[PDB]
């Protein structure tokens, strides 16, 4: 249960939620993406071991940015902090986005 190993759970929270966004959109034509985790078929915005909490922004009806914020013991993760993922598949960490060393290492 290193901070580093625990990041896998945060990454998965985001990737799984992105897949759910695409399904929700397809299942609900004309409605757009959702900020409600229940509509994604999730019973909690927390990751299974309560290491990250998922929040969702939908800047437009056809875009979303997912944020996994460390909670509980994972708040010690100063290096990677909040992980992010959007509808384009762009990954982020520690306030940065894209194909760079900081983001890439945080997604390992």
From Swiss-Prot:
It is found in: Cell inner membrane. GO terms for biological process: pilus assembly; type IV pilus assembly; type IV pilus-dependent motility. Keywords: Cell inner membrane, Cell membrane, Disulfide bond, Membrane, Transmembrane, Transmembrane helix. Methylated by prepilin peptidase PilD at the amino group of the N-terminal phenylalanine once the leader sequence is cleaved. The keyword Membrane applies. Disruption phenotype: Mutants show lack of surface piliation and twitching motility. Although piliation is abolished, PilA stability is not affected. Disulfide bonds join 80-106. Essential component of the type IV pilus (T4P) that plays a role in surface and host cell adhesion, colonization, biofilm maturation, virulence, and twitching, a form of surface-associated motility facilitated by cycles of extension, adhesion, and retraction of T4P fibers. May stabilize interactions between the major and a minor pilin subcomplex required for efficient pilus biogenesis. This is Type IV pilus non-core minor pilin PilE. It comes from Pseudomonas aeruginosa (strain ATCC 15692 / DSM 22644 / CIP 104116 / JCM 14847 / LMG 12228 / 1C / PRS 101 / PAO1). The chain holds residues 36 to 141 of 141 of the full protein.
